[PDB]
Amino acid sequence: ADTIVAVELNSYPNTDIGDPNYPHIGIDIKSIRSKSTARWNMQTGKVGTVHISYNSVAKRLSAVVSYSGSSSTTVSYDVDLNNVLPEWVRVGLSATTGLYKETNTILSWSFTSKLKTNSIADANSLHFSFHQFSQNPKDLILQGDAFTDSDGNLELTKVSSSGDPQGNSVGRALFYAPVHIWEKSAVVASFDATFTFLIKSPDREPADGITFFIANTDTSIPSGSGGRLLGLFPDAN
Amino acid sequence: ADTIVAVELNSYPNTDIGDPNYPHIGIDIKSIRSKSTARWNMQTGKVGTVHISYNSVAKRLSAVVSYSGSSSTTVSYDVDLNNVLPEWVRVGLSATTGLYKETNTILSWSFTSKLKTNSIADANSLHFSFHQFSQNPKDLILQGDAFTDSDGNLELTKVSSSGDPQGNSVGRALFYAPVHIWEKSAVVASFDATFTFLIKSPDREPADGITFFIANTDTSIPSGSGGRLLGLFPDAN
Amino acid sequence: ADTIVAVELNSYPNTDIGDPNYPHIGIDIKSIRSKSTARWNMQTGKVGTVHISYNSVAKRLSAVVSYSGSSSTTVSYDVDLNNVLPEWVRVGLSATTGLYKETNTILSWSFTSKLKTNSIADANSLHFSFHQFSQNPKDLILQGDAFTDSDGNLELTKVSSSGDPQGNSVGRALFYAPVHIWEKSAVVASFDATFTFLIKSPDREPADGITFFIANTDTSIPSGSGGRLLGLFPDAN
Amino acid sequence: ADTIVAVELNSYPNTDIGDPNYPHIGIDIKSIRSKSTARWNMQTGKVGTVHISYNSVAKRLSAVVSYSGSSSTTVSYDVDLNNVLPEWVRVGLSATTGLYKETNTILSWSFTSKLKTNSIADANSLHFSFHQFSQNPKDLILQGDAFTDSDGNLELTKVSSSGDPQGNSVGRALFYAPVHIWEKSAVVASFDATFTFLIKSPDREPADGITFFIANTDTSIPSGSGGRLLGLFPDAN
Ligand SMILES: CO[C@H]1O[C@H](CO[C@H]2O[C@H](CO)[C@@H](O)[C@H](O)[C@@H]2O)[C@@H](O)[C@H](O[C@H]2O[C@H](CO)[C@@H](O)[C@H](O)[C@@H]2O)[C@@H]1O
Ligand SMILES: CO[C@H]1O[C@H](CO[C@H]2O[C@H](CO)[C@@H](O)[C@H](O)[C@@H]2O)[C@@H](O)[C@H](O[C@H]2O[C@H](CO)[C@@H](O)[C@H](O)[C@@H]2O)[C@@H]1O
Ligand SMILES: CO[C@H]1O[C@H](CO[C@H]2O[C@H](CO)[C@@H](O)[C@H](O)[C@@H]2O)[C@@H](O)[C@H](O[C@H]2O[C@H](CO)[C@@H](O)[C@H](O)[C@@H]2O)[C@@H]1O
Ligand SMILES: CO[C@H]1O[C@H](CO[C@H]2O[C@H](CO)[C@@H](O)[C@H](O)[C@@H]2O)[C@@H](O)[C@H](O[C@H]2O[C@H](CO)[C@@H](O)[C@H](O)[C@@H]2O)[C@@H]1O
Ligand SMILES: [Ca+2]
Ligand SMILES: [Ca+2]
Ligand SMILES: [Ca+2]
Ligand SMILES: [Ca+2]
Ligand SMILES: [Mn+2]
Numbered sequence: 001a002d003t004i005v006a007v008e009l010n011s012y013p014n015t016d017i018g019d020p021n022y023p024h025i026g027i028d029i030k031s032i033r034s035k036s037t038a039r040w041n042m043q044t045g046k047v048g049t050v051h052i053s054y055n056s057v058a059k060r061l062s063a064v065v066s067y068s069g070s071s072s073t074t075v076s077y078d079v080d081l082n083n084v085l086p087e088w089v090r091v092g093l094s095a096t097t098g099l100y101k102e103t104n105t106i107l108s109w110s111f112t113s114k115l116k117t118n119s120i121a122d123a124n125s126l127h128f129s130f131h132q133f134s135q136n137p138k139d140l141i142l143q144g145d146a147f148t149d150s151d152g153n154l155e156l157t158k159v160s161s162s163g164d165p166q167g168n169s170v171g172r173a174l175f176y177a178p179v180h181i182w183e184k185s186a187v188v189a190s191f192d193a194t195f196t197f198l199i200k201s202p203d204r205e206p207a208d209g210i211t212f213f214i215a216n217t218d219t220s221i222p223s224g225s226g227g228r229l230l231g232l233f234p235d236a237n
Numbered sequence: 238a239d240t241i242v243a244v245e246l247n248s249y250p251n252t253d254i255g256d257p258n259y260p261h262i263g264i265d266i267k268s269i270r271s272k273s274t275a276r277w278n279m280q281t282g283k284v285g286t287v288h289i290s291y292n293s294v295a296k297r298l299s300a301v302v303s304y305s306g307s308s309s310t311t312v313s314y315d316v317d318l319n320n321v322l323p324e325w326v327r328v329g330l331s332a333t334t335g336l337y338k339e340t341n342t343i344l345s346w347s348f349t350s351k352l353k354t355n356s357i358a359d360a361n362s363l364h365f366s367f368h369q370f371s372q373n374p375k376d377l378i379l380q381g382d383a384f385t386d387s388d389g390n391l392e393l394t395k396v397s398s399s400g401d402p403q404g405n406s407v408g409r410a411l412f413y414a415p416v417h418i419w420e421k422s423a424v425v426a427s428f429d430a431t432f433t434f435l436i437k438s439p440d441r442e443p444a445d446g447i448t449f450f451i452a453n454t455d456t457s458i459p460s461g462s463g464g465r466l467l468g469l470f471p472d473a474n
Numbered sequence: 475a476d477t478i479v480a481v482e483l484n485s486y487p488n489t490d491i492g493d494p495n496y497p498h499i500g501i502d503i504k505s506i507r508s509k510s511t512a513r514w515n516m517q518t519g520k521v522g523t524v525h526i527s528y529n530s531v532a533k534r535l536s537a538v539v540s541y542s543g544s545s546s547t548t549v550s551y552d553v554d555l556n557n558v559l560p561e562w563v564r565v566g567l568s569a570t571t572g573l574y575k576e577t578n579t580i581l582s583w584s585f586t587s588k589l590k591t592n593s594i595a596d597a598n599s600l601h602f603s604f605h606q607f608s609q610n611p612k613d614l615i616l617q618g619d620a621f622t623d624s625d626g627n628l629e630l631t632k633v634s635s636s637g638d639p640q641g642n643s644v645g646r647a648l649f650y651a652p653v654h655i656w657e658k659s660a661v662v663a664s665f666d667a668t669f670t671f672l673i674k675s676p677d678r679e680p681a682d683g684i685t686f687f688i689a690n691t692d693t694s695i696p697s698g699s700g701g702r703l704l705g706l707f708p709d710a711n
Numbered sequence: 712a713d714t715i716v717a718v719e720l721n722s723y724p725n726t727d728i729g730d731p732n733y734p735h736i737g738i739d740i741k742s743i744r745s746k747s748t749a750r751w752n753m754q755t756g757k758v759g760t761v762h763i764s765y766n767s768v769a770k771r772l773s774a775v776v777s778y779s780g781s782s783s784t785t786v787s788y789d790v791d792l793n794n795v796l797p798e799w800v801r802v803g804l805s806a807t808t809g810l811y812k813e814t815n816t817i818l819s820w821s822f823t824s825k826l827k828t829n830s831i832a833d834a835n836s837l838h839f840s841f842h843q844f845s846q847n848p849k850d851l852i853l854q855g856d857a858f859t860d861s862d863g864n865l866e867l868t869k870v871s872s873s874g875d876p877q878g879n880s881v882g883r884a885l886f887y888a889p890v891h892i893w894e895k896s897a898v899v900a901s902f903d904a905t906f907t908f909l910i911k912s913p914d915r916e917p918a919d920g921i922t923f924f925i926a927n928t929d930t931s932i933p934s935g936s937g938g939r940l941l942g943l944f945p946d947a948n
C-alpha cells in the first residue's frame with residue numbers, strides 16, 4: 001500500500017482508534033495512530049498557518065499551528081525518514097468530512113526541499129509557492145473531491161454554492177513533480193512547508209481534518225479511507 | 238504544432254536556412270530562423286555556462302555564454318512572451334547531431350519563475366536546481382536519446398561507452414511540472430535559468446547544437462526535426 | 475557628491491524643474507530630471523506595490539506600480555549601471571513633504587542581488603525581506619525623520635500622534651550591509667526589489683513623493699534636498 | 712563579555728580544558744567546553760564542507776562535516792537559542808593558531824535566517840552567499856589577522872606569501888549586518904549556514920581550529936583568546 005508520513009490537524013476526536021479526547025495536531029508515520037500529539041486550540045472561522053520542518057542531521061520532524069494573536073501549538077518527533085520513505089516521493093495535502101463536516105479551505109501553500117552535498121550547491125533543490133490557486137491547476141494532481149474555487153482557494157472537500165461544506169467528503173491535492181527526498185550519497189536533506197487554511201463549520205463538532213503528507217509517487221486515495229482516516233489510510237491499524 | 242521559444246547554441250552553420258556562417262547563439266521565436274544572433278567563440282573541451290532571463294515589464298529576453306577566463310557573448314530580443322506563449326508551459330533542453338556530431342552533455346541546470354501581483358508574495362513561484370543528475374530522474378521527461386549517465390551528467394544525444402558522440406541523434410529533457418508562465422491578473426512575470434554544458438567532438442566541424450526551450454505542455458520531438466532543426470521544429474520555415 | 479540612481483514616485487508636479495504636469499513614476503539617473511516617465515494614476519488611501527528590476531545583460535531598468543484591481547503603470551530605461559554606479563553601493567528608500575504633505579508609509583520591502591559567474595553559483599548573493607518593521611531596526615540606517623512606528627510600519631517622513639503627516643519633512647532608510655552591485659569579472663549582475671506603501675493626504679495636492687534608490691555607500695541627506703528634490707539631490711540640475 | 716554560541720572544528724586536543732583526545736567537532740554554548748562533541752576524521756589537504764542548522768520549534772542545533780568521498784561526522788545539541796542569544800546578533804567565522812599552526816582558509820560561505828509569523832511571508836529573511844571573496848569585502852568586518860587574498864579566499868589567520876601558516880594568530884570575519892535572530896511575536900525562527908574550508912599544515916599536529924559563531928552585535932576578539940580558546944572566549948571557563 002502507500003507509505004504515508006503526515007502531519008495531521010485532527011479536529012474530531014475518534015477515541016475508539018487512538019485520538020486524544022480533543023482537537024489535536026499529530027505526526028503520523030505509517031499509521032493513523034499519531035506517534036506524538038498536542039492539543040490544538042482550534043478556532044473556526046479564523047485563518048491558520050502550519051509550518052513543518054525536517055532535517056536529516058537533526059532527525060526531527062516538527063510542526064506548529066498558530067492564529068493571529070493566539071498562541072501556537074507545537075509537536076515534534078524524532079525520526080529518520082530515510083528509513084521510512086522511498087527516495088522519490090510526492091507531497092500533497094488532504095482532508096475529509098464524515099458524519100460531521102467543516103470547510104477544508106487551503107488558502108496558500110509552499111514547499112522547499114534540498115539535497116545538499118560537498119559545497120554550497122544543493123545537488124538538488126525544489127521549491128514551489130502558491131498564494132492563490134489557478135482556476136485550472138496544471139501543476140496540481142487533484143484527487144477525490146478536491147477543487148480550486150472561483151476565489152482561487154483550494155477546497156479539498158465538497159462545499160456547495162452557498163459555501164456550505166458537505167459531509168462524507170474526501171479530497172487531496174498532490175504537487176505534480178515527484179520530489180527526490182533523499183539519496184544514498186547525500187550529506188543533508190531538508191524540506192520545509194507552510195500552508196494556510198480556513199475551517200468553518202455549521203455543526204458544534206467539526207470533523208474530520210486536514211493533513212500535509214509525503215507519500216510514494218503513486219499515492220492514490222485508499223478505499224474506505226474516509227472520515228476519521230483522513231484519506232490516507234485504509235484501516236486504523 | 239508546438240509553440241516553441243528557444244535560445245540556441247548553434248555550433249553548425251546552415252547558412253541556407255538562416256545561420257550566419259559561424260558558431261552563434263540565437264533567440265528563436267516560433268521558428269529555426271533566429272530573430273537575433275551573435276558570434277559564439279565556441280570552445281570545444283571547456284565547460285561553458287549559459288544564463289537566460291526574462292521580465293515581462295522589461296519585455297526583453299537575454300542570454301550570455303561564458304567560459305572561465307574567456308569573454309562572454311550576449312544576445313537579446315525584445316518580445317512580449319504573453320503573446321507568444323500559452324499560460325502553462327514546460328521548460329526543457331534539447332540537442333541533436335546530424336552528419337557531424339559532438340557531445341551534448343548537460344552538467345547542471347536551474348530555473349526559477351515568479352508570477353507576481355500586489356506584494357512581496359509571488360502568487361506563484363517555481364524553482365528547481367540540479368547539480369548532478371540521478372540515474373533515474375523521476376522529475377525529468379526524457380524524450381529521444383536523452384539519458385543520464387553514471388557520472389550524473391544528462392546526455393541529450395547518444396554517446397558510446399568509450400565516450401564518443403554519435404551522429405543523427407535527437408534528445409530532449411523537460412522538467413516534469415507545468416510552469417505557469419503568465420496569467421491575466423499578473424502584474425509581473427519573470428524567469429531565469431542556467432545550465433552548464435560540455436561539448437566535445439572529433440569532427441573538424443561539430444554539429445549541431447544545444448537549446449534551452451520553452452514550449453506547450455504537451456510538446457514532443459517533431460518528426461524530421463533532427464540535425465539543423467535541433468529537435469524543436471518540423472521544418473525550417 | 476552622491477551618485478544616485480532612483481525610481482521615483484513623484485506625486486507633486488514641479489513643472490519648473492522638469493516634471494510632467496501630473497503625478498508620475500520616473501527613472502532618475504544622477505539627476506532629479508527623470509530620463510523617462512509615465513503618469514501614475516495615484517490613489518490615496520490605498521496600498522500600492524512597486525516592483526523594480528535590472529539585469530546587466532539586458533541593460534534595462536524597469537519599474538511598475540499597481541493597486542489591487544487597478545491597472546499598472548510601467549516605466550523603463552536602457553542603461554548600463556556599471557558605468558553609472560561604483561562597485562559597492564547601498565540601497566534604501568526616501569521620501570519628503572514640502573509645502574504640501576502626505577504620509578510616506580512603507581509597509582514592506584524586499585531586495586535581492588546576484589553577481590553570477592561561470593556556474594549556477596552566484597559568486598555573491600544578498601537578500602533581505604521585511605514584512606514588518608522592528609521597533610528598533612538594528613539593520614536599517616534611518617536618515618532624517620525616518621522612523622518605524624508602533625505598528626511595525628516604516629515612516630520616512632514626519633507624522634504626528636493622530637497620524638497626520640507633517641510638511642517639510644525628509645527621511646531615508648538605507649539597508650545596513652553595503653551591496654557589491656558589480657565586479658569587473660562578473661558575467662551577469664541582477665537585482666530585484668519590491669516595496670509596499672500607503673500614501674494618505676489631507677490637502678488636495680499631495681506632495682512630494684517616495685523613491686527607491688541605489689547610491690554610494692556613504693550617501694547622506696544632501697543639504698537643501700527637501701521637498702521636490704526627494705532627499706536625493708542638492709540642486710535640480 | 713560576549714554571549715557566544717559556536718560550532719567548532721577543533722583540530723588540536725587540549726584535554727585539560729575539555730577536549731576529547733582527538734580532532735573533534737563540537738557545539739559551544741557560552742564556553743569553550745563543548746556541550747557536545749564528535750570525532751572528526753580531519754583530513755589535511757582536502758577541502759571540507761560544514762552545514763549547520765537550527766529551527767526554534769525542533770529546538771535542536773546540528774552540524775555535519777564531510778569531505779568528497781569520505782564519510783561525514785555529525786553532532787547536535789538540543790537548545791533554545793531564544794534563552795541564550797540576544798534578539799539581534801552578528802554571525803561570523805573565527806580561527807586561530809598557537810604553538811602549532813595550520814591554514815584556516817575559507818573558500819565559500821552562506822547563511823540564511825528566516826523569522827516567521829502567520830503566513831508564507833517571513834516577517835524577516837536575510838541571506839548572503841559568497842563563492843569567492845572580494846579583495847576588499849566591504850560587507851565583512853575583519854577582526855584580527857583575517858584578510859582576503861588574491862585568489863579570493865578568506866584567510867582567518869596569517870599565512871606567508873609562500874603560503875606557509877603562521878603561529879599565534881587570531882582571526883575573525885563577521886557579516887556586516889545585524890541579523891534579527893528572534894523576536895517576541897515570532898512563531899518560527901530558523902537558520903542555515905554553510906562554509907567550505909581548507910586546512911593545511913606542516914606540523915605533525917595542526918592547531919587550533921575554525922569555528923562558525925553567532926554573537927552579540929558588538930562582539931570582538933577577547934584578549935587572551937588565542938590558541939585553544941579560538942578567538943571566542945577570554946578564558947577556558
Ligand atoms: C456511530 O458512532 C461511531 O461513528 C460516528 C460517526 O462516524 C462518522 O463520522 C465521524 C465524524 O465525522 C468520522 O470520524 C467517522 O469516520 C465516520 O465518518 C462517530 O461520531 C462516533 O464517534 C464518537 O463515538 C466513539 C464511540 O463512543 C468515540 O470513540 C469517538 O471519540 C466519538 O465520540 C463513532 O465512531
Ligand atoms: C547534403 O548537404 C546538406 O546536408 C549536409 C549534411 O546535413 C546533415 O548534417 C548537418 C550537420 O550535421 C545537419 O545540419 C543537417 O540537418 C543534416 O543532419 C550539410 O553539411 C550541408 O550544409 C552545408 O552546405 C549548405 C549548402 O551549401 C550550407 O547552407 C550550410 O551552411 C553548410 O555549409 C547541406 O545542408
Ligand atoms: C511659491 O511657488 C513655488 O513653491 C511652491 C511651494 O514649494 C514647496 O512645496 C512644494 C510642494 O510641497 C515642494 O515641491 C517644493 O520643493 C517646496 O517644498 C510650489 O507649490 C510651486 O509649484 C507650483 O508652481 C510652479 C510655478 O508656477 C509650477 O512649476 C509647479 O508645477 C507648481 O504648480 C512653486 O514651485
Ligand atoms: C606548555 O604546554 C601547554 O601549552 C602547549 C602549547 O600551547 C599553545 O599552543 C596550543 C596549540 O597550538 C594552543 O592550544 C594553546 O592555546 C597555546 O597557544 C600545549 O601543546 C600543551 O597541551 C598539551 O598538554 C596538555 C597538558 O598535558 C594537554 O591538556 C593537551 O591536550 C596537550 O596534549 C599545554 O597545554
Ligand atoms: Ca479524528
Ligand atoms: Ca545550425
Ligand atoms: Ca515633484
Ligand atoms: Ca583545542
Ligand atoms: Mn488524530
Ligand SMILES: [Mn+2]
Pocket residue numbers: 245247255256257261263271
Ligand atoms: Mn542558428
Ligand SMILES: [Mn+2]
Pocket residue numbers: 482484493494500506508
Ligand atoms: Mn519627477
Ligand SMILES: [Mn+2]
Pocket residue numbers: 719721729730731735737745
Ligand atoms: Mn574542542
